[PDB]
């Protein structure tokens, strides 16, 4: 019969030094290993902005056990990949190859993260890549908006910039990278996640090569929410705008309520070229707006804070109408105009969406790593779906209530002549 082998369970281990090890023997032809580090942009301070961006770009530079040339050639010889994926909180060094080649890629992985050299000339040669890297990202109008959104919202850590500030390009020093690694790439801030690897092997390498102390402690300086608005006169045909208030920290019951509210109002599309009939915000705007537009519920959760609200793309003149329609739509949920089937639909969208998000090993590994860092545990899909179910309709209304009444953060770019200030909402 065309049946698969019975699926193995994830093996999870908290080492006494704080380090987390997780692995799943999925019997896949290829393997995937990630070192997830509590070293994202939020741990930069005003004296060293952009250091974690240069570091992100630096994964291919000379290490003690492998030269720059060796890392590139050795990985390509086996058709492997080495990727470093930063967020505002995390840095994830993910390695990928066929299962016979794990040992080679592990050694490369360990060298990049635990024995980088940041050679003076090698680092100087790489600085121009910050300009190239930023330019390519910043050609999405969304990138600069969500960058400005965070700078407006927080006074503190999450305010940090993800891409290196222009004035710091060519200015981030080898010592700054050395200091960033020494005090963020430590055992208690780390998690080693394996796919297509046995737990005794991952536990072995963690106990041998990942026992690093002498860094910083908690999840940094507690991210202080402030609020405010950043405005960018652009001449960019359409106006991109994001309205946001403080929501919930990831993992909390309230966080789940915000995720359900996000799906009530409307996240991404579901049908290729669709009117988005179940999208509450989209229908609310479309009633009053007839030109090209887009609107979506924005939901960002972090370790010690969150940002919930909405994001709009509209014609410059239509900007005020789109934001006001969108805001008023949230206001009706806050007032209590939300049905039980409405929430049920959102629940199914969130449940299935999450399940779809961990379908691939790329998505599964990223989730286990983020979990290991945020929670210190692994939470199976069946129980995540249980937590989603636990959200009452009142909790969704209260999440809306919290947004409507909380100090706002705004970021907008384009021809802002008709884009409203917070003042005027």
């Amino acid at each position: 019969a065309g049946v698969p082998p019975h699926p193995q369970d994830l093996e999870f281990t908290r080492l006494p030094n704080g380090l987390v090890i997780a692995s799943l023997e999925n019997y896949a032809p290829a393997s995937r290993i990630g070192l997830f580090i509590k070293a994202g942009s939020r741990y930069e301070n005003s004296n060293n902005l952009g250091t974690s961006h240069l570091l992100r770009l630096a994964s291919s530079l000379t290490t003690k056990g492998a030269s720059s040339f060796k890392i590139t050639r050795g990985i390509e010889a086996v058709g492997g990949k080495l990727s470093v994926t930063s967020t505002r909180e995390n840095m994830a060094y993910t390695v990928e190859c066929l299962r016979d080649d794990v040992d080679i890629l592990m050694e490369f992985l360990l060298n990049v993260t635990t024995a980088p050299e940041f050679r003076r000339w090698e680092v100087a040669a790489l600085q121009p890549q910050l300009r190239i890297d930023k330019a390519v990202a910043l050609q999405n109008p969304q990138a600069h908006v969500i960058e400005n959104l965070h700078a407006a919202a927080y006074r503190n850590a999450l305010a940090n910039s993800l891409y290196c500030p222009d004035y710091r390009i060519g200015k981030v020093t080898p010592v700054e990278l050395h200091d960033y690694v020494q005090n963020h790439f430590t055992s208690a801030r780390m998690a080693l996640i394996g796919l297509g690897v046995s737990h005794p092997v991952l536990k072995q390498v963690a106990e041998q090569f990942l026992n690093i102390r002498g860094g910083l402690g908690l999840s940094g300086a507690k991210a202080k929410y402030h609020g405010g608005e950043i405005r960018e006169q652009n001449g960019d045909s359409l106006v991109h705008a994001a309205l946001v208030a403080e929501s919930a920290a990831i993992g909390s019951a309230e966080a789940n309520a915000f995720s359900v509210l996000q799906h009530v109002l409307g996240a991404g599309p579901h049908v290729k070229r669709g009117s988005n009939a179940t999208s509450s915000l989209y229908q609310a705007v479309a009633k009053g707006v007839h030109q090209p537009f887009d609107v979506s519920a924005f939901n960002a959760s972090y370790s010690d804070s969150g940002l919930f609200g909405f994001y709009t793309i509209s014609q410059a003149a239509s900007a005020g109408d789109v934001i006001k329609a969108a805001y008023n739509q949230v206001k009706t949920i806050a007032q209590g105009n939300l049905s039980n089937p409405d929430v049920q639909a959102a629940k199914n969208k969130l449940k299935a969406g999450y399940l779809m998000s961990v379908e691939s090993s790329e998505g599964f590994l990223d989730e286990v790593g983020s979990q290991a860092l945020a929670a210190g545990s692994y939470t199976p899909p069946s129980t995540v779906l249980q937590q989603i179910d636990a959200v009452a309709d009142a909790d969704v209304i209260n999440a809306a209530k919290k947004f409507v009444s909380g100090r706002k953060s705004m970021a907008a770019s384009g021809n802002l002549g008709h884009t409203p200030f917070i003042d005027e909402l």
Binding site: V78, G274, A277, G363
Partner: protein, 446 residues
């Protein structure tokens, strides 16, 4: 321990079953809570005449906007409410409709797919609304230099054959296509022996075959007979299309020789050589230390913003070569360095680099088949192009076979001393004259 060869055996067999009307029903059962179900139709733009070149694309725009059993909003609402994602695409040879859904929602997903495939309510008010949407998309596609150059490459290579046509069709055909034009195409093309109901995820095969008899039966009674439409081969021409535009910041070049087509065993060997040359992008970390000679020289001498190799496959034909985007002053060097690489490989390929190309491919093939949407796509497409699902162990077997002698023989068969199809767009004053490109297709030393 579980070795890589052992792990290829572990992936379950794709179960293929045929319905009485000609509908092929194929599944790859896995452990996942979700799935991807879809219908793959052997229909594109190659199947279209000059007078109905926008048809498949027009039907694609209408397929989700309402059926006879589910009018207007109804399909959107039903799919959205269960958390499912509904998608479609049309290429020159294949049209696909597929649902990403929970495995317990497989009964509904199959049912909805049947409605889209068989009962598309091509509403007169909607086909009028869709023509403004497609026209806008044409204006949208013009701004994508990449989409343009490849469309030009097909237009010049497949000169005066069905394959020269784009999926979208010309502006004239979009504004002129009637309701009758689309139903005529649908009745001619959306017939069971040209459809595969493919699925991947937490589903039993018996569940899927039941549903196909439950929802797809009713395409028999009596079928085909009067109009049997088999594809005629498409003549490839060594030719050049040069759209000079000095107002665009960077030049786009797509250069290709005639490839053999889907079925040919030496597509594997061509792909290994295409891996050796590989692809580049200005955001790649590798720089000067990159394995690939073209990639390494391109990074060092800042010779482009990107390049990519390709092996575009059609029935009995295809396009094989490279595309790149570069500064106005860098087109000549880029052509030289690429052409020299084709020739190096044609005459003097080496054991080591060929193993790397084999390894990149093994990795490309396994990394691609990750999750229900890629596997379901691979089931639908393979059944149309190969007739069976080629198991990963067999792909490995066919990859493992390719030594240096294979690469240089197979490369020579297609690359050595052949006329390329050249498509150029943007600031292309420095783009080599065709004769010179033709001259770079052979070595005087060899």
């Amino acid at each position: 321990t579980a070795t890589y060869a052992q792990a290829l055996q572990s992936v379950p067999e794709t179960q293929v079953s045929q319905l009485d009307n000609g509908l092929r029903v194929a599944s790859e059962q896995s452990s996942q809570p979700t799935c991807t179900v879809g219908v793959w139709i052997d229909a594109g733009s190659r199947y279209e005449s000059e007078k109905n070149n926008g048809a498949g694309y027009f039907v694609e725009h209408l397929a989700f906007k309402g059926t006879k059993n589910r009018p207007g909003n109804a399909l959107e609402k039903e799919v959205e409410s269960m958390g499912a994602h509904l998608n479609a695409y049309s290429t020159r040879e294949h049209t696909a409709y597929y649902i990403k859904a929970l495995s317990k929602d497989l009964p509904k997903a199959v049912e909805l797919l049947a409605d889209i495939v068989q009962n598309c309510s091509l509403e007169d008010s909607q086909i009028e609304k869709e023509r403004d949407v497609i026209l806008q998309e044409l204006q949208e596609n013009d701004t994508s230099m990449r989409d343009v150059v490849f469309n030009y490459l097909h237009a010049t290579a497949f000169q005066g054959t069905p394959l020269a046509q784009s999926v979208e069709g010309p502006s004239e055909n979009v504004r002129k296509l009637s309701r009758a034009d689309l139903t005529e195409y649908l009745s001619r093309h959306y017939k069971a022996p040209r459809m595969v109901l493919a699925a991947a995820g937490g589903l039993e095969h018996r569940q899927l075959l039941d549903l196909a008899q439950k929802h797809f039966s009713g395409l028999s009674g009596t079928y085909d007979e009067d109009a049997v439409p088999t594809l005629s081969p498409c003549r490839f021409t060594g030719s050049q299309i040069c759209h000079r535009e000095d107002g665009l910041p960077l030049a786009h070049v797509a250069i290709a020789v005639e490839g053999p087509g889907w079925a040919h065993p030496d597509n594997v060997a061509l792909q290994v050589a295409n891996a050796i040359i590989g692809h580049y992008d200005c955001t790649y970390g590798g720089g000067a230390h990159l394995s690939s000679p073209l990639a390494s020289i391109a990074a060092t001498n800042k010779l482009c913003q990107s390049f990519q190799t390709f092996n575009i496959c059609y029935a009995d034909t295809g396009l094989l070569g490279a595309h790149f985007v570069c500064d106005h002053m860098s087109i000549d060097d880029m052509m030289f360095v690429l052409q020299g690489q084709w020739m190096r490989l044609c005459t003097s390929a080496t054991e080591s680099e060929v193993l790397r190309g084999k390894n990149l491919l093994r990795n490309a093939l396994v990394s691609h088949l990750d999750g229900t949407t890629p596997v379901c796509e691979d089931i639908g497409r393979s059944l149309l192009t190969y007739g069976r699902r080629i198991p990963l162990a067999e792909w490995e077997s066919r990859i493992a076979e390719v030594d240096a002698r294979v690469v240089r023989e197979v490369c020579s068969k297609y690359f050595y001393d052949q006329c390329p199809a050249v498509a150029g767009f943007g600031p292309i004053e420095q783009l080599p004259d065709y004769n010179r490109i033709r001259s770079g297709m052979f070595w005087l030393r060899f």
